[PDB]
Amino acid sequence: RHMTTLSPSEGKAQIRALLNLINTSAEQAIAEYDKQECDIPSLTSGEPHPMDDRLPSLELKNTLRILEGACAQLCVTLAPPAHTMLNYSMDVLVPSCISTVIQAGVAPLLAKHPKGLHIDVLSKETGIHPQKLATILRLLILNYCFQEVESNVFANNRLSLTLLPETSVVDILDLKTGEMHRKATLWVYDALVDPDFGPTYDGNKSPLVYALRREGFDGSLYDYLQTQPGAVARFARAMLGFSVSRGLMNLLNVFPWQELAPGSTVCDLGGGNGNTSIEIAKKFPHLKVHLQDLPDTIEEAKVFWKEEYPDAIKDSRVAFTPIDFFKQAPVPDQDIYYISQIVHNWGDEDCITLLKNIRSAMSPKSRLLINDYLASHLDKTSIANQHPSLPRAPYPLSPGFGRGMARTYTGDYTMLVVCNSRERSLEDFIELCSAADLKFVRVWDLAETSVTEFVPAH
Amino acid sequence: PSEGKAQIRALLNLINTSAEQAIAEYDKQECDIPSLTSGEPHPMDDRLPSLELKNTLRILEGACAQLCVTLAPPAHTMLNYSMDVLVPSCISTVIQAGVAPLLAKHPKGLHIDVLSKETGIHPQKLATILRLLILNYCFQEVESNVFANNRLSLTLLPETSVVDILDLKTGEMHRKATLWVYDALVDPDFGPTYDGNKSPLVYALRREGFDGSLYDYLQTQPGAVARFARAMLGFSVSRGLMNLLNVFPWQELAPGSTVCDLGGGNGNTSIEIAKKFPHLKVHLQDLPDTIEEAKVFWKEEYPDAIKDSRVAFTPIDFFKQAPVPDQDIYYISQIVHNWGDEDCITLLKNIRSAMSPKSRLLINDYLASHLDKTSIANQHPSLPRAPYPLSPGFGRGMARTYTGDYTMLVVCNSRERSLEDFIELCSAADLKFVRVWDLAETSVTEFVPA
Ligand SMILES: NCCC[C@H](N)C(=O)O
Ligand code: NA
Ligand code: NA
């Protein structure tokens, strides 16, 4: 129409530019589906789309960042503030419903009956009152998870299929919506102003540990998981699925592993089982990988590598060396030292200690890759003056990608309430590395976390 | 070419045209587009949102949500859903910490260290909380580590008609209501019934040694009953329920027609009806103490209606006695969704027994309709229809109907009802369904004596 141009203003120009971002991003997402020769996904189909279990392309993830940011900004601009804030206040409800239907096994039950089940059958099988379960299901269905095929007859759709026990994402969805995460957010303010739990970032003083203490539990997160049967393996699968659902394997496509000389060494410092190094070695057979972690984890990793990629052990392309990376330096003269989701778990002093340990082991050919969210400040000046190798949100998105980069900030807050740690900005990382005589090179954007590269300064 | 591509482009068209019409709604009041960085309220922030704006927002939000969820991988969307507890947690925390009033006293903005000193919260932790809110357009960072209010955080000021409902919905009691929902639902005592003392909230409160209803619990907490009453009023105001005045055709009733505000408390709704439509007479009926309070309220806010003999007050227990007879309109709002079927049918038969052949009953409540394609395709023509290709209905655009129902379950052990549920109850009370009057929030369903 003409409503953006009849009585012109800067605000109308910004609305029209948001509309342009939405339209062009949607067309680019269509192009991504065309590139893979796939049709557009359906929210009513009862079977997965071919790309549901595939690594999302970098282009699709960047597109979605812009599309989600622009849609969110457009709606929040045009709606009355009380409307948006009321909806925010009720956003706890959908994750509550997800946890409830996971506990009730609704999605596997519906997978046994793909054409759908009447709500009385679901009630008989779950033990939940049929109208209460229908209330839960309809809130999820309104949000495109499950579907109502006839009145009071419910079926799976492509979003509820992520809740099947076999998928790679059900465990992280179960953990993030689960009772432990709900306890972590139950008394956040009280923990933050508590004279003992408030002032420090100590591991045993998170809001989760505060809630556990307040209910009579003695022990940290670790101990709490150990006391819950089958919960440590649940947490491990959840971490793996958190990496998978976020498309972190796009590392393999962003950093130029193919341009490293044959025989180059990648030291996966603190890589646990080496789930990343194993993919690097599988995809780039000209590289050698070194897994370093705690001795027990190193034995688990030897078994894991024997399971999944014995060829690397037979070819002498994988090596394993135990380490406590706070007390000893890693193996020297590696071409790459890779640390992923390690810095955001420790305070500044321990990080500087680890960074100095890494720096002491490096040669002129060495570099350090840090895989972590970059939790940038949200003022216009910080965003404008960021390093040009960082992705920049297009006009008129603000702050940055807005909701399009939500997981950087929901991640940070999660780190606070569950682990009492924090994500850091690019400036924070540069300052820590500079204290360890490491000079910044550039950011390798994964459209989720970022891989920042540093080299020995002197 | 493909149906999926055509649906994506139809969603784009819905987004474009709905945004255009939202702009037209701002132009109609000679207002510019609101700003997400401005430190002062937009002139329409405290105004009743027009029916047209709420309609286009239903479409715009439903279409944006459906577009993003269609194009994103399911794991991406579900991961973001799984983290949706965090923003309300942050809202509750900044409310308890008083960040918005503090920033109101210093409109330029405050450094994070000043906010930390004033709130007792570590500055980097407070910064994490604030930045999650700010990414969602609540508050803003004007300079690095210097934060200020914006138009969304202004809703958190103590004087607003929305801060109390936001405080309640994000607060500790509501967090306890969603703590153990599954366990409550499969428990053989809490699961099978809708008894007031068997809600998921009460299930969680048992672990503190409490047992009773929500009303009992509120009376154990200092200042909780008053905060709850303020929150209910503010929930009504912030949802634009006063669009009742603009949807039901009060001006098409003949002068002298009577409106019986049944269970209307102080008469907050009927006093606005009486002011906008002086040709109507209002009869307010509620509990005796409430009726005396309402007399005081009307003497303070609309004494002309008392001088002109346009408002009457008659105490009632509407489960035990019939309302005053032969009124043109009987109006009940947010009552049915608080009671079970048997009590509702009792109240409806009481109302029916008082009606004359010309009387109508208006029920204001959410219509928690079924979401299958057949129910939606064959719904009553008076219901709003979501345009192609929105599904189910308006999708996320009508979220508050379905977050309302779930809220009623976990906090109150009650439920919203579908249109068919309402029609069946009223038919059991010898009331025939006429039509729905869409408020673009709740709905007002009309019934007549059969
Ligand atoms: N016959 C099916 C009734 C479903 C109807 N749309 C309702 O939700 O009221
Ligand atoms: Na649970
Ligand atoms: Na704007």
From TrEMBL, chain A:
UniProt keyword list: Methyltransferase, S-adenosyl-L-methionine, Transferase
InterPro entries for this protein: COMT-like, COMT_C, SAM-dependent_MTases_sf, WH-like_DNA-bd_sf, WH_DNA-bd_sf
Keyword Cell cycle: no
Residue ranges of domain O-methyltransferase C-terminal in the record: 219-383
One GO BP annotation of this record: methylation
GO molecular function, one term: O-methyltransferase activity
PROSITE patterns from the UniProt entry: SAM_OMT_II
Classification via Pfam families: Methyltransf_2
Highest taxon of the lineage: Eukaryota
CDD domains reported in the protein's UniProt record: AdoMet_MTases
Name of the featured protein: O-methyltransferase C-terminal domain-containing protein
Organism: Pleurotus ostreatus (strain PC15) (Oyster mushroom)
